[PDB]
Amino acid sequence: SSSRNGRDSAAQRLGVKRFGGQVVKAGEILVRQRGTHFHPGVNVGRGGDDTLFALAPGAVEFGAKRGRKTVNIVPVARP
Amino acid sequence: ARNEIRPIVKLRSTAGTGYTYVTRKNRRNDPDRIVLRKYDPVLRRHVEFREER
Amino acid sequence: PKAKTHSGASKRFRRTGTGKIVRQKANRRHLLEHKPTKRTRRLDGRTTVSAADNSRINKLLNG
RNA sequence: AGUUUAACUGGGGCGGUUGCCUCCUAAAAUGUAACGGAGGCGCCCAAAGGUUCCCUCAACCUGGACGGCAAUCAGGUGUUGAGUGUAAGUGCACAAGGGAGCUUGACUGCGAGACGGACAUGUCGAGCAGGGACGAAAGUCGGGACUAGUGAUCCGGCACCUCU
RNA sequence: UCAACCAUAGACUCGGCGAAAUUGCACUACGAGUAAAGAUGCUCGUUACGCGCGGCAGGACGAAAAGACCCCGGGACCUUCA
RNA sequence: UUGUGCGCCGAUAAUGUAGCGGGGCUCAAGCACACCGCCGAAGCCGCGGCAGCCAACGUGUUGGCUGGGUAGGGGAGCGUCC
RNA sequence: GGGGAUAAGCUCCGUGCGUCGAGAGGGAAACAGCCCAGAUCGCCGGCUAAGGCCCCUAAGCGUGUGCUAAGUGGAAAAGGAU
RNA sequence: UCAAACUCCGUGAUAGCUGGUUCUCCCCGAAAUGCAUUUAGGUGCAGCGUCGCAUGUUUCUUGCCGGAGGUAGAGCUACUGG
RNA sequence: UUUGAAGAAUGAGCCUGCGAGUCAGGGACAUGUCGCGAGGUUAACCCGGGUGGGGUAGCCGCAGCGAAAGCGAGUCUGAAUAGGGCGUAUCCACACAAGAGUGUGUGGUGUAGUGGUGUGUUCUGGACCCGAAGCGGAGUGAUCUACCCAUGGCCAGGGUGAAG
RNA sequence: GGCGUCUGGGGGGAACGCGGGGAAGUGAAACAUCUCAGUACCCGUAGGAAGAGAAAACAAAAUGUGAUUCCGUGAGUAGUGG
């Protein structure tokens, strides 16, 4: 007379965190993710948990490189 | 967890003239215990340890 | 009479020059067999207390 | 003699369950409950880790000694339907799949800036230094394709210290 | 069945003494309905001359008792290989 | 034979009409589509008094905005005794 | 949207959606959550919203063109019917 | 009055519990959610309130440009299953 | 008190009088006010008919970092000036480096705490008020009732007819 | 042991003291260690006051102090503590 279900796992707060256009510093986290849904491009690095981060400051551009959505960083214009 | 004689057993990895116990948990149904091993100690440098429990 | 002090709050909480409150961090004593060193390394040092517990800790330390 | 003998619960009891991971509900950011629906864990690993290099499967068609629905072989089609240590998802053919040679970075001293955030916990982290591996070099290596695999504080125990 | 009659103590009337528990109020109707889901007090309609006396006991969720069944919290006492 | 707008039967519970709020209404006082006016609130406006925030000016005047309020926070006061 | 019987004035979540809670007044026959509207005090002043204008109830037995015959309006199904 | 009398004292025992808590005006003004909990009717922190200081429109609204999503819907010789 | 009570949920018969955030303490934190100002202030006590004078033992500030030795506007870790942590009132002006988010060296401006008192919250005490069941210590109670002891008294009248 | 003689003690008291015994409700949001408290209470003895009291003490290389007790501070500190 039991429901043997009921369990669940607390969240991990995944997804995009710095969308198109924004200004990001270095080492900042663009997206947390399990697999490489989004891949790195230029001035972008990968983590251990397939997190992404910035290697050079600038601003974002979610473009594709041969069918795969990438993330990039572009040079800000110095004031 | 506990201290049962688990498959993943043993510990301690001591150094020759290098007293910096580096630790690792490994099995013991396999044979070996008188070769390999290496690491950086204090004041010294990349040299060779024993797995000495 | 006087206002007596809290032993634990005195032994696990100090104050710096400019009045900050300071603590140490957790999961450092035992079960290090499997904790990577970076995790063992952000837990060293001291850390400034949060905002939310500053007041409670003032009230424990002083009286 | 002094005292303890839990909570949830569509009243209580009986039953079942309590922590962690994955999916749906969950309503195209995040997050979100129910005694709602399906599963799993309380590990393993001289290599199933690091690095350099090389190769592509499953399936079907045919040939073919035992051999058959299938065993190893050869020849074609085959963009990826296999496999990925272990549940599921996200990803992986540009391979993270398969294989071979060296090998211990399954290091020490740190860490800008950030996520998530009641709080304590938790997660990644470029880059600097010694001292190394591999490689011709560039460069990669601070464990494992990622997320689970464990338990705060107190009190004691072992080795080392130029602290008392 | 199936109930009838009689007498005493009361009850009723008169004279005297003279309390009580209870009580937010008050010149305190009925219905169909609405509403914290069973209305004297609200809505819409119907009925009712003011004030009393004897009597019945349907309601006033009537009076009494800070529920005794249930649940929670704290105690008590009893038991036992806690 | 299709699609429509109103309609009929199916229809049927217990204190009393009782599934328009009542009288009553098709000589619509009912449904629809357009049109004209009107009533209607502590809303807005109109005439006045007080008050809080800000601003402008002058030795406290004016103006704009504002003023429902329980838990609650803050501010300013009456009254009693010695 | 889940559980439930795709029942509950059921239960559990979402929502820069609302109101009640803490919010009066008007309409809804009476009716915390519905529609309108957010009450500084006064006036024997005016215009409007939602809603409504035969009498009770202040305002239109208003105008025009058609339908309704069932008191439909002023509860209701599968289905039946010149 | 007895599942362990009565009286004085400790003792003003203690209750996550029920009740009660007195004069006025002015201004602003909520919540009923989250994690944990010997915990679910209580409490701690975050949330929403006000008071004071600081920072000055950083909040909010509308328009335009840039970005990821896998919901409704639809589709299936575009995969897994019927 | 409730999500929600005119409520057929609780409380109140009526009047009059009585009845609940208080006090201590150089206590703690925050904030107004007053004296002093890089200083501030006394305690016990002594002298004082009084509320006044004295009293430097003490406390708070004036430099911190570090587990500690210890060092000192720097210090800790570390092999390291190589990064970081904490601290150096704050601002102001000029420089050099980068715009990985600003830093570093100069110059000047120069740091404000303390003791009374008032308000609010708060700690220890009965701590806003009333309310238990029940725990403990020392005593009172068997004249009621339970049982026992010592000593006396009471049981009309009529039947049955055991042993011997 | 018996007989005679002589002197003492015997009990009351409001608190205060010294030696001895000696709980529990409470707090720990349970609780036993702990705390409440060596408190309440009980005992034995006193005095106008008591008890303690003359170093088999402190201290730190300072060339120091010099019986004891009671007050202020040190100090809610060093520390102790499921």
From Swiss-Prot, chain A:
Transmembrane segments: none annotated. One of its GO terms (cellular component) is cytosolic large ribosomal subunit. InterPro entries: Ribosomal_bL27, Ribosomal_bL27_CS. One of its GO terms (biological process) is translation. One of its GO terms (molecular function) is structural constituent of ribosome. PANTHER family: LARGE RIBOSOMAL SUBUNIT PROTEIN BL27M, RIBOSOMAL PROTEIN L27. This is Large ribosomal subunit protein bL27. It comes from Mycolicibacterium smegmatis (strain ATCC 700084 / mc(2)155).
UniProtKB/Swiss-Prot annotation, chain B:
The keyword Membrane does not apply. PROSITE patterns: RIBOSOMAL_L33. InterPro entries: Ribosomal_bL33, Ribosomal_bL33_CS, Ribosomal_bL33_sf, Ribosomal_zn-bd. SUPFAM superfamilies: Zn-binding ribosomal proteins (SSF57829). Pfam families: Ribosomal_L33. One of its GO terms (biological process) is translation. Keywords: Ribonucleoprotein, Ribosomal protein. GO terms for molecular function: structural constituent of ribosome. GO terms for cellular component: cytosolic large ribosomal subunit. It comes from the Bacteria. PANTHER family: 54S RIBOSOMAL PROTEIN L39, MITOCHONDRIAL, LARGE RIBOSOMAL SUBUNIT PROTEIN BL33M. Belongs to the bacterial ribosomal protein bL33 family. This is Large ribosomal subunit protein bL33B. It comes from Mycolicibacterium smegmatis (strain ATCC 700084 / mc(2)155) (Mycobacterium smegmatis). The lineage of its organism: Bacteria, Bacillati, Actinomycetota, Actinomycetes, Mycobacteriales.
UniProtKB/Swiss-Prot annotation, chain C:
GO terms for molecular function: structural constituent of ribosome. SUPFAM superfamilies: L35p-like. Pfam families: Ribosomal_L35p (PF01632). GO terms for cellular component: cytosolic large ribosomal subunit. Residues 47-57 have a biased composition (Polar residues). Gene3D superfamilies: 4.10.410.60. Residues 1-41 have a biased composition (Basic residues). Residues 1-63 are annotated as: Disordered. It comes from the Bacteria. Keywords: Ribonucleoprotein, Ribosomal protein. One of its GO terms (biological process) is translation. The keyword Coiled coil does not apply. The keyword Ribonucleoprotein applies. Transmembrane segments: none annotated. InterPro entries: Ribosomal_bL35 (IPR001706), Ribosomal_bL35-like (IPR021137), Ribosomal_bL35_CS (IPR018265), Ribosomal_bL35_sf (IPR037229). HAMAP family: Ribosomal_bL35. Belongs to the bacterial ribosomal protein bL35 family. This is Large ribosomal subunit protein bL35. The gene is rpmI.
